[PDB]
Amino acid sequence: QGIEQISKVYMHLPQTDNKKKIIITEDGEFKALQEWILETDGVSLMRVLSEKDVDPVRTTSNDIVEIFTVLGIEAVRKALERELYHVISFDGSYVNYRHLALLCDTMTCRGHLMAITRHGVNRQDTGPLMKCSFEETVDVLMEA
């Protein structure tokens, strides 16, 4: 039984409000509910989302290319923003959101995951001299 690639599932209740289930009561008040959430060690998101009695709204992943192949480029933009915010604000350090938004928009501007590494950025269309100044000067120059 089970779904392949998922070798360990930990079950726990959240102690942070961001993971708690915030609902709006009948009086318009925010109530945070303790709900069981399962954190895995593998990734197969389409199968888990299809699975019975799994909330296919808030169920997410920390793997970006899974979100891309499963959900789409805009879901990738949001999830990437959320992961960058998480890793930055883990140590209580605040960065203005517009910088994160600009980075995630730049990466996802071309409708596909454009990695900051030389492959993604030099793959993307820029001037020859700019790609030269990046890295990989000679081969860029030879192709140009």
């Binding site: 009086d27 318009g28 008040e29 925010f30 203005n96 959101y97 517009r98 910088h99 938004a101 600009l102 980075l103 928009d105 730049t106 990466m107 501007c109 900051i116 950025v121 269309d125 820029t126 001037g127 700019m130 100044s133 990046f134 890295e135």
Partner: protein
């Protein structure tokens, strides 16, 4: 080097060297990061 040339153009849009729109307004609001500051929305939390 990924975000070298991304600039706020004179039509208030954020574009790269290729003149491709990255954001229609900077930070989705067009506001610089210095003058903004933390505040509270008074009507969010209170009951009906």
């Amino acid at each position: 080097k990924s975000m070298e040339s991304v600039m706020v153009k004179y039509d208030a849009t954020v574009r790269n060297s290729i003149n491709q729109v990255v954001q229609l307004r900077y930070g989705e609001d067009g506001l610089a990061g210095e003058s903004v500051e933390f505040q509270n929305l008074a009507t969010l939390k209170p009951s009906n």
